[PDB]
Amino acid sequence: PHARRALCLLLGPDFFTDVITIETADHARLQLQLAYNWHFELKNRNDPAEAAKLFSVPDFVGDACKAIASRVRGAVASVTFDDFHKNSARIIRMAVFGFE
Amino acid sequence: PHARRALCLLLGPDFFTDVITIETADHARLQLQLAYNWHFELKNRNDPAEAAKLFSVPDFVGDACKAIASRVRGAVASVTFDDFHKNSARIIRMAVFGFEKARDQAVFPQNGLVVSSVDVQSVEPVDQRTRDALQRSVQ
Amino acid sequence: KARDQAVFPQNGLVVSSVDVQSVEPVDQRTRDALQRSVQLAIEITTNSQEAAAKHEAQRLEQEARGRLERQKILDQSEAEKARKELLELE
Amino acid sequence: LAIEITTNSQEAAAKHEAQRLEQEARGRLERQKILDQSEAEKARKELLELE
């Protein structure tokens, strides 16, 4: 959670990776290296308030992966191992994003 | 409850973690890492009364986790292990927030602390023999 | 159906919430007993997995023979459409 | 002996459920079955005309 110090907040279209450890309904123990493509998006780069919002969350990465892990881990527990292994792609890609 | 002393009261959108130990109806011993994304929410920032309300609860974090563990631990006792293991996500997500299906933000009215979402990152059988029994289930 | 605050009148103290954080069987022997009850609780779930699984295989087995047996029928009748003609020549 | 009775009550309600589900199984299955046999008889009758 604290393993790196930094001074400039990188907001451009970088990605970060994570390794989560999740469990299926079948109680299959799984480990997934995920990458999350991310970028901050500032609609009013000039607005001094919305700029500072950028630094609102102390640990933007932490905040992010913390959430994405919870989201997957919670959803995969609801699915069968075989079923996951066959659909991982869209299971996650749906468990992370508010499906439409 | 008292392992960190501090001078500035952090009120902005941080998250704090906790590791609780809860029992299901099946008497499954479970241990969860919960993160609680939170923020204090002051409407009248300049009003000195509501400003000081920030320092009402002497241990805002304690009070918060204290209360959350009670809410989870209480509602997980009325639920079956397996049924929980399939719906942990929403079992907790409801037990922490007064359901309306659920609600999505808890307010602690004394100090104004708002808990915005719970991140259930890690849930484990405490007893080894139980985790073993499950291993054959996967087999 | 219950209440939410307990006012102690003598000194005005109010208890606003009871946070039951932990509850434990005091006797070791008891908590031993209950660990077997969970052993048999995933037992029942393990077995109901096994169960509804075998129940599937059987319905799949039913598709199998039930379709296959009809394909077989609709084959023999095609052969008969031929055998009759051959039986004319015969 | 108090957790005895509850521990055994879990087993009991489990087996009763197991059995109700078992009912679902044979119950549908044996009717899926009849609905195949009749479907085959729809074919077999025509075959018997050729036969």
| First CA to last CA distance, chain B | 42
Which conformational region is residue B38 in: left (phi greater than 0), alpha (psi within -120 to 50 degrees), or beta?
Answer: beta
Q: Cα D48 from chain centroid?
A: 32
Q: Of C4, C5, C19, C35, which to mutate for an interface test with B (greatest number of B Cβ within 10 Å)?
A: C19
Nearest to B107 by CA among B35, B39, B58, B11: B39
CA–CA distances in Å: residue B20 to residues A6, B65, B114, B120, C8? 32, 9, 20, 11, 31
Measure CB to CB from residue A26 to each of B13, B37, B138 and give the nearest one. B138
For B34, phi then psi, to 5°, come to -110, 135
Alpha helices in chain B (DSSP H): 48-52, 60-76, 81-95, 128-138
Angstrom distance (rounded) from CA B74 to CA C20: 7
- In this structure, the number of other CB atoms found within 10 A of the CB of residue B69 comes to 22
Quickly count: other Cβ atoms within 10 Å of residue B119's Cβ. 23
Q: Classify burial at A75, counting beta carbons within 10 Å of its beta carbon; exposed 0-12, middle 13-18, buried 19 or more.
A: middle
Structural resolution in Å: 3.5
3-class SS shares of chain A: helix, strand, coil, % to 5: 40, 20, 45
Q: Bridge-partner residues for B112, per DSSP?
A: none
Q: What experiment produced this structure?
A: X-ray
Radius of gyration from C-alpha coordinates of chain C: 35
Peptide-bond breaks in chain D following residues (C–N over 2.5 A): none
Beta bridge partners of A91: none
Residue with tokens 């922490």: B96
Quote the CA–CA distance of B26 and C41 in Å, as a whole number: 6
**Structure token pair of residue C10:** 């003598």
C-beta separation of B91 from B99 below 8 A: no
What are residue C60's phi and psi, to 5 degrees?
-65, -45
Measure in Å the smallest separation between the Cα of D28 and chain C Cα atoms.
Answer: 9
- For residue A74, the distance in angstroms to the closest alpha carbon of chain B comes to 5
Burial class (CB in 10 A: 0-12, 13-18, 19+), B43: exposed
Instruction: Tell me the C-alpha distance between B75 and B90, whole Å.
Output: 11
**In the structure encoding, which two tokens stand for residue B134, read together?**
């499950």
Query: Which residues partner with A21 through β-bridges?
Result: A31
CA distance B99 to B91: 11
On chain A, the residues whose CB falls within 8 A of the CB of B123 are 23, 77
Look-up of token digits 């009809």: C70
B86 touches A77 (CB < 8 A):
yes
Distance linking the first and last C-alpha atoms of chain A: 32
CB distance B22 to B73 below 8 Å: yes
How far is it between the farthest Cα atoms of chain A?
51
